[PDB]
Amino acid sequence: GITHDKMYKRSKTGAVQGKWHKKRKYNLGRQPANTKLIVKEGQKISTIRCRGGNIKRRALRLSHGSFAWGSADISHKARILQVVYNSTSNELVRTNTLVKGCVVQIDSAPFKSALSNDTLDKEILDQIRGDHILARISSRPGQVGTADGYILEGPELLFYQKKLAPK
Amino acid sequence: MSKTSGLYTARKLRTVRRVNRWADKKYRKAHLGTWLKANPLEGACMARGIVTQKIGISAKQPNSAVRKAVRVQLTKNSKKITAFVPRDGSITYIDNNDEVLVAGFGRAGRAVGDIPGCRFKVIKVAGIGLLALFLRKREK
Amino acid sequence: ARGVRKHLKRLNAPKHWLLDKMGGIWAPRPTNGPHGLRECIPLILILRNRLHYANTYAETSMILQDKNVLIDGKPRTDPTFPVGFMDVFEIPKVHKTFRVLYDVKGRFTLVPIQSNEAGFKLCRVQKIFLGDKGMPYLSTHDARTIRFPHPDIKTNDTIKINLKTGKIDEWYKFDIGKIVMVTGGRNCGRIGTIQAIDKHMGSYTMIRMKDTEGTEFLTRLCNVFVIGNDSPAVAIPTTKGIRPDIIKNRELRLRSIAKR
């Protein structure tokens, strides 16, 4: 079931192509692993058997990620406080999905240990003294099962803040 | 004029023969498929039938003779065909409501010679060969 | 197909081994091992069919599992194990010390060589890769995965595997001036010298090869193999890569029946 094969799809001129084969395990798909944050139960990540003996960590829920600074490279294990602006869909960020590529608020407290230095990314250093630092999840929870993010910096910080500034 | 004398007129040339080719009567009967449906025998060499009634068809006016024929009902497609009992005195062996084998007259379905309305022959009556019951080799 | 193919049909089986079309729809399986199906000959073919040795396939197997046979410095009791180019097929118990090399015809046949030249099996480096972490590696056609290679060897180079010693000590390049035995396509098994090597982007590099008498053969870079800088590194089959022409083949064969 849940096939990814091209027989079902229409051709280039939009001509339907008749099916010549029953579906096969080589092309398969599963109900997607939407990844729920645990803001409100420890992180539990199912392990799903895959083709080739390899295994994929199904992210039913995740709570903590490794986020790294854009210049000083602090890289601190932290908590994903909340999720905003998935861009692929507004609703995914309203159901707290942690799909990779989503701005997430990370707790400032572990990464506040880096507050001592100055000339160090002043716009984010202000955000470090503020209870949340925006970061974009950079690994796929649905396959990897572990979500790590990079600190929001550079022009992207400006756009993703511009996006969250009407609020 | 066959014309189309162009290096780049192979497309036109290929189709012109394909379209005009169907016109040839022999090719048209051969591959239209109208006859594969029409043939009572279904294109089979021979087909089984049940005898419905012995009939006499007068031959063409040049050759005046009462040809003797049997109306047979094909078992496969329930078509009422007329077969000609062959040779001399053969009708006496044939009985009504009796199984029969029927095969082509050899002109390719067309009537052979002077038999009006007849296109098929009776190879076997009730299993036993018609020729055998005529040559005496196998009797009733 | 579902899973993996498990049997071999003789009619599909190759023209190079040459099996009797009659006597079995099936053929011995080129079972997995050191040499590839296109470039290998099953040992049970080189035991039963080649030397006309033991009688049946079951009988061949009984000797095989009695540990009576040796291949490439180890015994290997597999019944249809692969035997390839330069695979030292020799039996110590029969004292038959041979090696397997390609004929001018294109069927590898046994070329006799003693322990002195049976100590080392010649091979070519096809791929250099970083494997098992950052340890650079070297792979030969018979799946001989030596580890850290010598700095001089790049690729299309030649390695003297040492059998029981199993190490690389002698390295020969493919650059023009090294005698090259062709192992693919039409020439498929005759020696020569490299007239030139020519490359095209992402396309088969064509290496010119002319025999000692003359006669050109232009096989692609993958099939080309460097047997020696000059002369065989181990031995040449008694054809020396002459390739006698079609009438010449008739000439040799006609007197062959007369000799009896």
Binding site: - | - | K21, M22, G23, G24, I25, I246, I247, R250
Partner: protein
């Protein structure tokens, strides 16, 4: 499935394009008398071979002269004819092949070469002799008269190792 089906077996008969011409048919009775051939098929058998032997040559005779392919393919055909003996060591050339005829091909048969020696009597007795195995090149009492004894073994042709100890006529 079954190695049996991978056998190439064909037909040697070369049936005529027109089956009822009396000039040809009556000569068939005449050739049948000349070599004692049992069936029209027994002529047809060598009719195919004869025409084919001439046909292969008619290709290589008009083929590029002194060509390597012609030399190898011509060598085979001429050699076949020298050992069988239809062609000769004087002729030794592609040109002579066309002249061969079906009866000239029949000459090499054991119904014909036995007749030249006269070991087995007239072609009538001669065919009877091979079936009765009283004639052979030697050591293979031939049952089949079709055996085309080659020129080398025509001199070697002989009466059976065992002819006619309790002969059938005087057996009782």
């Amino acid at each position: 499935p079954r190695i049996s089906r991978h056998r190439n077996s064909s037909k040697t008969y070369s049936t005529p394009k027109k089956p009822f011409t009396k000039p040809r048919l009556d000569a068939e009775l005449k050739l049948c008398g000349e070599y004692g051939l049992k069936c029209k098929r027994e002529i047809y058998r060598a009719r195919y071979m004869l025409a084919k032997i001439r046909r292969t040559a008619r290709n290589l005779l008009t083929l590029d002269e002194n060509d390597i392919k012609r030399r190898f393919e011509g060598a085979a055909l001429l050699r076949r004819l020298h050992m069988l003996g239809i062609l000769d060591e004087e002729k030794d050339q592609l040109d002579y092949v066309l002249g061969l005829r079906i009866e000239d091909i029949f000459k090499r048969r054991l119904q014909s070469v036995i007749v030249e020696s006269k070991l087995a009597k007239s072609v009538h007795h001669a065919r009877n002799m091979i079936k009765a195995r009283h004639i052979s090149v030697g050591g293979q009492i031939v049952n089949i008269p079709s055996y085309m004894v080659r020129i080398s073994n025509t001199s070697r042709v002989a009466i059976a190792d065992t002819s006619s100890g309790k002969p059938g006529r005087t057996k009782r």
